[PDB]
Amino acid sequence: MQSINFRTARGNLSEVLNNVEAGEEVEITRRGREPAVIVSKATFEAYKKAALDAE
């Protein structure tokens, strides 16, 4: 699941990364605070990398 509150993220990070590796983009939302996204490093490094232009 790609939406997970703060309490559900830390309370279960073990499973959280397991499914990230697998690899879901998991979103860690907090009460009043901006939303986050935990995605596998391997993958974001590629999102980031494609960011290329114009070479």
Automatic annotation (TrEMBL):
Origin superkingdom: Bacteria
The alphabetized UniProt keywords are: Plasmid
Q: Does the keyword Transmembrane apply?
A: no
Q: Does the keyword Metal-binding apply?
A: no
Q: Which family does it belong to?
A: Belongs to the phD/YefM antitoxin family.
Function (record text):
Antitoxin component of a type II toxin-antitoxin (TA) system.
**What is this protein identified as?**
Antitoxin
